[PDB]
């Protein structure tokens, strides 16, 4: 995957402001209009203009305050894009276009369509803005992704044959980036598919809407003594967290008892791997001296 | 920074006719601390846990069978696999009492443990353990806590001004294929300074969510019924597992929007171009040319 822009540099004077764009392909015809959005810049579209700017003018603007376009004293709220891409369009005298759009760039380019129909000939799409009614109707993509490695196909494809738990879980969800070093200590164990029973076996029964019944059954019972327990207790949660989302952590201090909480900070999943000083130190503080 | 060698000397010990690999290091005579790793990891996931508690406790951190360096005998691998070979790792170091530091599936098996050993346990440090999760529509929650933090007073400009969270965090991480330094180093330029990451802050708290910010909610509501009755041509580009739209999502639309073509790009979390961009830039080619409107008479 290319890593140059190799596209000359265009600029419109827009609202007492100069926006950049990318403008290539030919003269005559429908151009494709490309809009970016959060963080991006027409360089996320780098890679795919080259396969349009054969056939068709492709115009790919910095929005303002991003990419190289300027960086006036604005709110940047959503109504400041829309004027000044709309005051880009019509600086171009563009007529009828093409949309590829993305993100905040979908919120923009939506909006201009839905108020000049006519003048819009296609809509290219993806990962776009939508009204989510409910803060529970928030997409989880782990959803979807978690139930998939819980199969036996599917999963077991994922897992085993590709590795997905070493070379994607597992760096994935570090905040901070694991070197190739420690990728391949954690590399070592599995490097033959199969070795890589144990890695589908663990989320194949992880305890979850009642299923597996065999695990939700002794889990429940570990937490219920854990409930009862006057056992020393102590809990490292980060934000924002995999297993225990930390309405969960905070659910815990109120129904565990003898319980201690540190919070570590950033952290998903191997919380180890993000704050290893705070976690090791703090447990032999919580420790008894001899 | 954070350190990548295991300067750990190997140990192992014979458990149910297989050999389990382990550190132990620390002052003997005590109740030691028993760190327990689950999946994919190893003991090498306590390796700089461990100097902090070994100048005054012992610490055992074992290999769950059929990882790390431990044996990698025929079984199922299904839980009580693992309780059976960990039970008897615990009885063939001649443990009696104990602290347990756990972890994921080694929190399922050292509280299973400690449940069944009450009296030997003298405390439990845990992190990321497993407990009943109550049903999928609930869990998992991280998307959801990023977002609402992006738009939480103070916390959300911490993250995304302060530490440039949708630069270093958000854009990488939601990319499959790694971006390289090059790449990166583009994305960063024009966000070098904080105060220029404003545009940044205010894009997720426009996002319209609950009816909020009532204006954005009342233009998005507008646009999506309109592209629900316009015979625009579309095209939706969508991967797996996707971050906005997930596959499910996308197969919904699938079925409720006119006129609209569905391309399936593979993997793919939020930035889609930066995965498979030569089939969206190919297939946008393979599809500009119907869009032509014959001149009309």
Not at 16 to 34: A, E, K, N
Not at 220 to 233: D, R, T
């Amino acid at each position: 995957i290319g890593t140059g822009f190799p596209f000359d540099p265009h600029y419109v004077e827009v609202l007492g402001s100069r926006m950049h764009y990318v403008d290539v392909g030919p003269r005559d015809g429908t151009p494709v209009l490309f809009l970016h959005g959060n963080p991006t810049s027409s360089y996320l579209w780098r890679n795919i203009i080259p396969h349009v700017a054969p056939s068709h003018r492709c115009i790919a603007p910095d929005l303002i305050g991003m990419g190289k376009s300027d960086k006036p004293d604005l709110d940047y709220r959503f109504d400041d894009h829309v004027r000044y891409l709309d005051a880009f369009i019509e600086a171009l005298g563009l007529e009828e276009v093409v949309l590829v759009i993305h993100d905040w760039g979908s919120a923009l380019g939506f909006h201009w369509a839905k108020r000049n129909p006519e003048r819009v000939k296609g809509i290219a799409f993806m990962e776009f803005i939508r009204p989510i009614p409910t803060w529970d109707e928030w997409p989880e993509f782990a959803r979807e992704l978690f139930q998939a490695f819980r199969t036996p196909d599917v999963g077991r494809e994922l897992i085993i044959d590709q590795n997905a738990f070493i070379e994607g879980i597992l760096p994935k969800f570090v905040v901070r980036p694991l070197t190739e070093v420690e990728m391949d200590h954690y590399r070592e164990p599995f490097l033959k598919p199969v070795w890589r029973e144990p890695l589908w076996r663990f989320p194949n029964e992880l305890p979850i809407a009642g299923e597996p019944a065999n695990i939700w059954a002794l889990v429940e019972a570990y937490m219920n003594w854990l409930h009862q327990s006057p056992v020393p207790k102590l809990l490292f949660w980060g934000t924002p967290g995999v297993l225990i989302p930390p309405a969960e952590a905070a659910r815990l201090a109120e129904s565990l008892p003898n319980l201690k909480t540190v919070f570590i900070g950033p952290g998903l999943h191997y919380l180890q791997e993000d704050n290893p000083d705070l976690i090791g130190s703090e447990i032999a503080r919580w420790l008894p001296a001899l």
